[PDB]
RNA sequence: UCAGGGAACUGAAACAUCUCAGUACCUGAAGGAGAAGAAAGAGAAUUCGAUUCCGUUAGUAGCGGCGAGCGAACCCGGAU
RNA sequence: GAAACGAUGACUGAAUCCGCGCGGACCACCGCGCAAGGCUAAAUACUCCCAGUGACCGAUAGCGCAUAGUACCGUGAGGG
RNA sequence: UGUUAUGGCGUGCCUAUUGAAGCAUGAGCCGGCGACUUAGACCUGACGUGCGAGCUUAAGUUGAAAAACGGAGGCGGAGCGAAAGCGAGUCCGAAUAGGGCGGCAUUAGUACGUCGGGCUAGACUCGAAACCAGGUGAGCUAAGCAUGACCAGGUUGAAA
RNA sequence: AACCGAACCUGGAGAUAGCUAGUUCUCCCCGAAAUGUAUUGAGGUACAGCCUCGGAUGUUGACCAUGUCCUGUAGAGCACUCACAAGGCUAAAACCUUAUGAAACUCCGAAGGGGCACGCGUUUAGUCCGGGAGUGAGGCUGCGAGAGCUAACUUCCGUAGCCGAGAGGGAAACAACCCAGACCAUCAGCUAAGGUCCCUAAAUGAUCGCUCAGUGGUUAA
RNA sequence: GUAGGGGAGCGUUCAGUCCGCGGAGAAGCCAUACCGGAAGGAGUGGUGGAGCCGACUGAAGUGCGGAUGCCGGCAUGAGU
RNA sequence: GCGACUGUUUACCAAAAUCACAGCACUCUGCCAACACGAACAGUGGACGUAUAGGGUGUGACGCCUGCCCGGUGCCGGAAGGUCAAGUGGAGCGGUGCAAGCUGCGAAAUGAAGCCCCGGUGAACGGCGGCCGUAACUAUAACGGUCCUAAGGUAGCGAAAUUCCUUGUCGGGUAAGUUCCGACCUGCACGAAAGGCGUAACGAUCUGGGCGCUGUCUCAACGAGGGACUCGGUGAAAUUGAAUUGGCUGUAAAGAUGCGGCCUACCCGUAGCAGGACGAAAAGACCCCGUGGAGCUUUACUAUAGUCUGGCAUUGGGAU
RNA sequence: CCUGAGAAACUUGGAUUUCUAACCUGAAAAAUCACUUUCGGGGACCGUGCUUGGCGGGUAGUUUGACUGGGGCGGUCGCCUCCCAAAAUGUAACGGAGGCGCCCAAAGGUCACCUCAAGACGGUUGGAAAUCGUCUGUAGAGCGCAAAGGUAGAAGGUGGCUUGACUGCGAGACUGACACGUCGAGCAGGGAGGAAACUCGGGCUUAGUGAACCGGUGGUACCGUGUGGAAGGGCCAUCG
């Protein structure tokens, strides 16, 4: 006549969002200590003027202007060059 | 954390300096067995090494 | 009826010269062996509420103290 | 008005301490009022000087599942 | 609550002047005080009743009533 | 202006809703009654007014076909700290680096009124089922106690 | 004592009521939301988000172009992972030719999007300080997905538009579709979607064809 | 243009003041083709029989179709 | 079938298989009895009764009977020990003053009832059960019976007021029998005072069958009386947005007299019918929701009348 | 003046026994009582009063979450990773898979050194795989645990020294409604490794978590109710 279940899911679950990616893009002014990429790994390597926290977070060290170096795929660098 | 705590325990590292100051971290008892001996700063002087008080 | 002062807010909130509202950062009572030492340091402290939370506190203590 | 006895709804967005509230109600005794009163006091100036009442101190000091919420007194100014 | 002080139900129970009681655990010191015996007007409260007033009402308003606790309902309390 | 014929056009109102002519709610009709208010000498803004580095009284006193007195108090005047305390500085600290603040490149408050809103109170109006207190009820009904009343006539035929 | 899972009367008492109803005079201006997270929370509330009034600023907003950086979808592709079609070859695996599927494969990889600078060029918004809110049930269609049976006037998200809160013409009728945003007056003119045999405003229009089945006027192997 | 915010007003009682009407007739009631952007407002006439309009200012028990709202009167069902 | 019986019950939907009952059992109670109503050392019921009496509990005439399990729980009893509150006892720690002193906290040992623990207890609460293998597509009617917790059904009964599979299977009755009866045992999920199986008699009980008789029926007629109808008299009600209130098919919030198209229809009423007007009545009583309510239950939390218990007081003397 | 005891006494108790004037209770010319006595009996118990602990649905007040293609049953509730997610972030479902509530005293700091899986040829136990060698060898391995990104000029394997798994701070950003959360240059004290430039305020990264409240503990001498102390609070640390 009717049915009695009984099944469910073992799924559903997921994890709260991890707002990643670059926050500071090609040709952008930058204050000292402004963050420029959140990333899982070495996706973007620090160049001149940019350091890297343990989160592999890239944060700029001395003001200036942001510049993206794509060195042919899998090896890429972000840097600051000050204006003048 | 919780009571049962067989491996790893919150131990407090109290100074020899007799200042009053101490620290806290965790030791496994599988590998420390006897005691814990560490060399950290003391802010009531400067840098005087502590032992693993209960 | 004279509006009473919200006695909870006595020990946890501060009025400022200009007219903003302050409190102490939180998580400092058994979340310790965490730690990190810079957290523990950063927490014992004090700080200003974001903003939306201002009106209420102001209404909590009419005398400012 | 004083005294003996003394609720719950409700508020705590549930509830038990708490709150409603010593309110409602019940009983008692008494008057045109009654109560209270002549410091084993308040208090911190070695200050004040019977009690009651008004303003004020003051939503201060404190009370509190330190939650909801409850909340003086001294001084000072009056009425007598 | 660190809980002083008053207050009694139970048990117990001291000093009387170089003595006694307090001052918020507790001690010293420094201050305020004379418990266990009584009465006391005045300022204060209320408004059944009386008088004056009103940016109160004028017949569904205003008291429930231009009067009635009547008619009427209820065994009754009571409602009206 | 009234009234009409005919043509075109046209899904009552309210409420509640994603969506109402709805076969969803309310409503017989008309007349009256019928719902955002009051209070505090509370809080916080807008407008206005009076004083203005100052502004203001409350109880009360006297007067009172009016109002005046009354400075006790309250608000500005300095902040910062857990506080002591320090003070255009202060707090963390051993000093630094910082937070709050003063200066700032300037900034006026206070008393009253009207208004917007907050709080506390019945707090826009109407509506529970319930909870508690004190009382009224066994002239109905459930039973008890004392005291009386009543059961045509017929059949059956136990012990002794 | 005509309704007893606790009588009735009065009182506390205007109990409480996150619930349902109801909420009254006119015109003018702007004008939402039904999203997010948190809640003994899910038809309730807090804070944001969105509305309005006021005071501040003073083009900071908007669109669109140029420049520059970010991306892993569409496709495609098989280089890894998993899966797979015929054959070779070998002791089956690896490997060789041929051949292919993929949300959780990627050698690659668009259109588009997002940030920043200008404004090289148009247009009007913005931001902050303070008062008042309301909203937190959404609804359909297209496109993009999951769930579902590539069912639902289905459910849950992304995105545009409309309804919601939108009257007017069209689609017979018809929130949503197509055209189109109604300050008022007119027995005035042009148009949009959609239409021009009669009901019904407007060519029983023109020319070259098609179908003869009322196909027109609803389905398939 | 819904919730909502803002702005300018209409009408009602009471109150202060000014104007001023009223038995050759007030308020209220009744009819109406006039006026104003709307709440609304006047003109005339009929009613009525003793009070009342306009203006500015102040204070509200201040504007109804709803609430199975309340009181009241009268309809329908029916000459059933 | 159920209950033995006469009786009793839900005023106003249940009269029964409910309750009560005589009989039976367990147990408590020695009298200021237990038990119960009470502000209460008052008073009273019990009862002016006295264990052949009284209370409480279950079973329910009568007959034959009433098995196994004391692990858990509850009651009765035991006691070596582990126990446990106030108190008794303060070794010892601090505060203060110069100190005599005043004073803050406070350990042993001791310390009641009760629980732990030992035994007993069923006409105490209760328990008397899990299961092993089948030809084929991740499977339906049917199966024979070994048996874990303290134990694992003695009689009697069994498809039952108890049976899921279910119209079980056979027999009976019937032309035909999902009901009834008998037998069977494979009792989903009987069973012995929550009584088991019988039982003459009793029943406005329930169930099946027969005889008789019949308008219950085939199948309805005729008749009567009382309404309904007509006239004179008196004259309600629930309901009601307003109504100028058709049919089909369609559309609309998805069930249209009111919207579209088409069709039908002169105006008004009387007696009649009940398809519609999602007709009337009761703000659904099912269902969900509300950090609504209330009655009830417990080994849910918390308290508490009552009650057991140690110490203090009434409260005294003596002897060992 | 006595260690330990023997007589006597005050005893102050503990238990028992017993007596009676408290108290309780029955009888007789006076019914409930009061008398009085024969009294008779009981008896310092019972009763009652304060306190101590136990039992106590007899009564009493209340509690008994939410999500949910109606509710209940089942499942689920915080955190991390991947896909969905439409090439920026974000984005729901009782959509599709999988982990966490730790671990490490070395698996950290620094310094120095080393390079993997796998196949092919040949090799005593072996002979699928063991251990050795040669050749190939960009990751086809490893990283304590899930997976994603990452990584061979190391994060991977090994050794030396070590306690930066540090106090006092924090320019500036990411991110969230708030509270949170995350990254972090640089200054001071003061240290570790390095010859040194230098690096180190834990771990390749992303889960390994709990706001307040009340309390434990080590320091501190801020307040301490006439003053000076002390109880108590406050501060930093820290445990539940
Ligand atoms: Mg309550
Ligand atoms: Mg409550
Ligand atoms: Mg009297
Ligand atoms: Mg005392
Ligand atoms: Mg009149
Ligand atoms: Mg609906
Ligand atoms: Mg709406
Ligand atoms: Mg209708
Ligand atoms: Mg309707
Ligand atoms: Mg409804
Ligand atoms: Mg109706
Ligand atoms: Mg002003
Ligand atoms: Mg004001
Ligand atoms: Mg209000
Ligand atoms: Mg009755
Ligand atoms: Mg009410
Ligand atoms: Mg009340
Ligand atoms: Mg507009
Ligand atoms: Mg808001
Ligand atoms: Mg621009
Ligand atoms: Mg593709
Ligand atoms: Mg290529
Ligand atoms: Mg919501
Ligand atoms: Mg929603
Ligand atoms: Mg949506
Ligand atoms: Mg849908
Ligand atoms: Mg439209
Ligand atoms: Mg239209
Ligand atoms: Mg049309
Ligand atoms: Mg539609
Ligand atoms: Mg055209
Ligand atoms: Mg034409
Ligand atoms: Mg408009
Ligand atoms: Mg006037
Ligand atoms: Mg008048
Ligand atoms: Mg009406
Ligand atoms: Mg009705
Ligand atoms: Mg009426
Ligand atoms: Mg007639
Ligand atoms: Mg009729
Ligand atoms: Mg008739
Ligand atoms: Mg019977
Ligand atoms: Mg009978
Ligand atoms: Mg009945
Ligand atoms: Mg009957
Ligand atoms: Mg004992
Ligand atoms: Mg048969
Ligand atoms: Mg049979
Ligand atoms: Mg029986
Ligand atoms: Mg007639
Ligand atoms: Mg007609
Ligand atoms: Mg249709
Ligand atoms: Mg029609
Ligand atoms: Mg019509
Ligand atoms: Mg009929
Ligand atoms: Mg209902
Ligand atoms: Mg007791
Ligand atoms: Mg209960
Ligand atoms: Mg639920
Ligand atoms: Mg569950
Ligand atoms: Mg995208
Ligand atoms: Mg969403
Ligand atoms: Mg608390
Ligand atoms: Mg301490
Ligand atoms: Mg201390």
CSV table of C-alpha atoms (C1' of nucleotides) in Angstrom, one decimal, chain C residues 1-8 10 12 62-63 65, chain D residues 57-64 67-71:
chain,number,residue,atom,x,y,z
C,1,UNK,CA,10.7,55.7,35.2
C,2,UNK,CA,14.5,56.4,35.0
C,3,UNK,CA,16.1,54.2,32.4
C,4,UNK,CA,18.3,51.7,34.2
C,5,UNK,CA,21.9,50.8,33.4
C,6,UNK,CA,22.5,47.4,31.9
C,7,UNK,CA,24.7,46.0,34.6
C,8,UNK,CA,26.2,43.2,32.4
C,10,UNK,CA,29.4,47.6,33.1
C,12,UNK,CA,32.7,44.6,29.5
C,62,UNK,CA,23.1,55.8,29.7
C,63,UNK,CA,25.7,57.4,32.1
C,65,UNK,CA,30.1,54.5,32.9
D,57,U,C1',21.5,62.1,46.0
D,58,A,C1',20.3,58.1,41.9
D,59,G,C1',19.2,54.0,38.3
D,60,U,C1',24.9,56.1,41.8
D,61,A,C1',26.8,52.2,45.7
D,62,G,C1',25.6,47.5,45.6
D,63,C,C1',22.2,42.7,44.6
D,64,G,C1',21.6,38.8,40.6
D,67,G,C1',20.7,36.1,33.3
D,68,A,C1',15.7,38.4,33.2
D,69,G,C1',16.0,41.9,36.1
D,70,C,C1',16.1,44.1,41.6
D,71,G,C1',18.0,48.5,43.8
